[PDB]
RNA sequence: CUUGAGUCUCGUAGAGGGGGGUAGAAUUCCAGGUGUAGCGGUGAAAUGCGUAGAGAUCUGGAGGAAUACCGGUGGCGAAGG
């Protein structure tokens, strides 16, 4: 019968507030969350979201 | 003789020259924390670097060159500068 509905195991850490940095080049756009204090919380990125080409730099693809 | 040329005091502007020190931003490298799979590259790509933990991100150190903006038809210089 059972048809699942939540997304992940059960929240680890958390920290209520973070830091965002997004480092845009011409190839390649790079989205990396992080503590105040200095800590990555975790990553995704323009390449890593199943872009390549000339679609890794690209607004629609940061944006993704 | 004194207009030429030289000379004296008072001042002014400027990256003019030489010798010493010093400060910040940044690329790098080593060290350590977090953190996950690409990163880097181009017209597109591959070689490279990456699951031995990279890229990104926070801290600390090391070193060496240059010295943003100000800077402008600017300015100084015998010219190169």
Redesign the pocket.
């Known amino acids: 019968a059972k048809a699942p509905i939540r997304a992940r195991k059960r929240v680890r850490k958390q920290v209520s507030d973070g830091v965002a940095?997004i480092?845009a080049?011409?190839?390649?756009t790079?989205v990396?969350i992080?503590?105040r204090?200095?800590?990555?919380?975790?990553?995704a990125?323009?390449?890593?979201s199943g872009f390549?080409?000339?679609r890794?730099?690209t607004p629609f693809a940061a944006q993704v």
């Open positions: 940095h480092h080049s011409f190839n390649n790079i990396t992080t503590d204090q200095g800590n990555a919380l975790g990553w990125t323009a390449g890593g390549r080409g000339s890794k730099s």
